[PDB]
Structure formats: C-alpha cells, structure tokens
C-alpha cells in the first residue's frame, strides 16, 4: 500500500525471540517478521534457524513492497543474530553495511535478578 525502495533493517536480538523489523530512510517501518509469524511458539522461538527463517520472511515481505537497498542494524545478541544477518545477505537483497548498536545503558538502573550477580 506504501513503497520506498531505499531503507533500514532492524534486528532486536533477545533471548526468547529474534525480532526483525524492516523500515524506511526516515524511521517508520514497512513490515516486520518474527519467529512466531512462521510457526515456532516456544523456546525454539529463540533459535538461530528460526531467526533465519524470520529474516527470510521479512525479506520476502519487503520485496512485495518494492524494496531494493538495505542497511543493517543489529540491536543486541540473541541466539542467531549472525544467522539472520547471513540470511539477509543471501536473499538477493541489496545488502549495504553491517552496523551493531547496543541498548547497553552506561550503567543506569540496577536490572532484574537475571542480570544481577553480573552486578
């Protein structure tokens, strides 16, 4: 319904699901695909093959909206972000440059009890 040709890919990479959101040169997204879109409702939700599949799905979706040029933003390290990256590279997609941006706080609030003991 929309279209833009140039743009970004965002990979939020958590434990439980490797989420891929694909977006325009401004910042408003076109489509997003997850492990739970193509099955995978569980622990295997957060799994490298699953992530790869999700990425592929996202790419396909992008291709339907007439999308060519893609810049890569990895946000974090969930289990298969590398796999996802590889998939993206593969898809016959105009894969530009690879960029890693962490939402690591510059020591902010003391987190939950599963990031605790790691101080």
């Amino acid at each position: 319904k929309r279209q833009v040709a140039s743009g970004r890919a965002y990979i939020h990479a958590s434990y439980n699901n490797t989420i891929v959101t694909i977006t325009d040169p401004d910042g408003n997204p076109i489509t997003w695909s997850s492990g739970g879109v193509i099955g995978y409702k569980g622990s295997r939700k957060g799994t490298p093959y699953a992530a790869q599949l999700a990425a592929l799905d996202a790419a396909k979706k992008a291709m339907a909206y007439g999308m060519q040029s893609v810049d890569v933003i990895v946000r974090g390290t969930g289990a298969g972000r590398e796999q996802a990256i590889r998939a993206l590279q593969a898809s016959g997609l105009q894969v530009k440059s690879i960029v890693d941006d962490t939402p690591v706080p510059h020591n902010g609030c003391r987190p939950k009890k599963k990031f605790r003991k790691a101080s």
Binding site: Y40, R44, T47, P48, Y49, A50, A79, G80
Partner: protein, 155 residues
C-alpha cells in the same frame, strides 16, 4: 570405540557381476545366515527385472540405490534435559548402507507371495522414482529442514 576409527568392512565381490555393492545388498537381504539362498533369490529378482523393465539388472539396481539415498539425515541427542532430533550430513558409505537397509525394509512390507517378486518390484520402483524405499528416503529428508531448528548442534 574411542580408540580406533574402526574399519569399514571388506566384502569379497559378486559371483555374477563383480561389484561389492551387489554383495553388500545380498548380505543385507540375508537374514538367518543363508547367503547361498538369498543370492539365488537376488539372481531371480534380477532375471525378473530383465524380463519386465528391459534394462540391465545391475544398472537398475544401481539406479535404485542412487534414488534411495539421503543427504541430510536425522539423529538423537538429549540436550537441555529433553531429547531433540539432530539433522546432519551422511558419510557416503553410511548413506549407502542406510539406503540398502531401507530397500530391504521395503521388500519385507510389499504385498505379494514369493519374496523374489517383491524385491524385483521394489527394484523397479526405485529405478522409476517411487516405491517404499523411496518413500522412506523422502520421509527422512522431510524430517530434516523441518527440525533444522536444532541444527546448531553439529555434535
């Protein structure tokens, strides 16, 4: 078992074709220790094949073998507390063995009277692209690329 890579076995080649594959197949066919009965059966099957699909009865066999082969096969490992199916590659030798086994299995779960007949039909099927062994191979293949979820454990 943790020492040696332990040897893949040597077979004395065939007494009609001069091919170790054939001998292996015969051995596989052989339950209860009667090669000198099962080899006759194999010969009969070959003859039947020759009669029906006007092909070389060695060539047909080879074709069947080629058809029944899996490239990504599935295995069993307990990781995380729970057992997950692990899909990975097959060594050529091992793959061949597997194929042979599956052909054998197909032969024993076919319909007709004399075993020779069943074996012949199975061979024909394999040559074509369908059958029981072929079906099993396909199933195996499907089991991989669907459970490739846990294919981050190459072992």
């Amino acid at each position: 078992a943790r020492r040696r890579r332990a040897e893949v076995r040597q077979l004395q080649p065939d007494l009609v074709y001069g091919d170790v594959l054939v001998t292996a197949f015969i051995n596989k066919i052989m339950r209860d220790g009667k090669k000198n009965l099962a080899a006759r059966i194999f010969y009969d099957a070959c003859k039947i094949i020759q009669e029906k699909t006007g092909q070389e009865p060695l060539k047909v066999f080879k074709q069947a073998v080629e058809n029944v082969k899996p490239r990504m096969e599935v295995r069993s490992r307990r990781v995380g507390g729970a057992n997950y199916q692990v899909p990975m590659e097959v060594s050529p030798r091992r793959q061949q063995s597997l194929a042979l086994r599956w052909l054998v299995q197909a032969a024993n779960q076919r319909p007709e009277r004399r075993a020779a007949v069943r074996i012949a039909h199975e061979l024909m099927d394999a040559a074509e692209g369908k059958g029981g062994a072929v079906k099993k191979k396909e199933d195996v293949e499907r089991m991989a690329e669907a459970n490739r979820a846990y294919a981050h454990y190459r072992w």
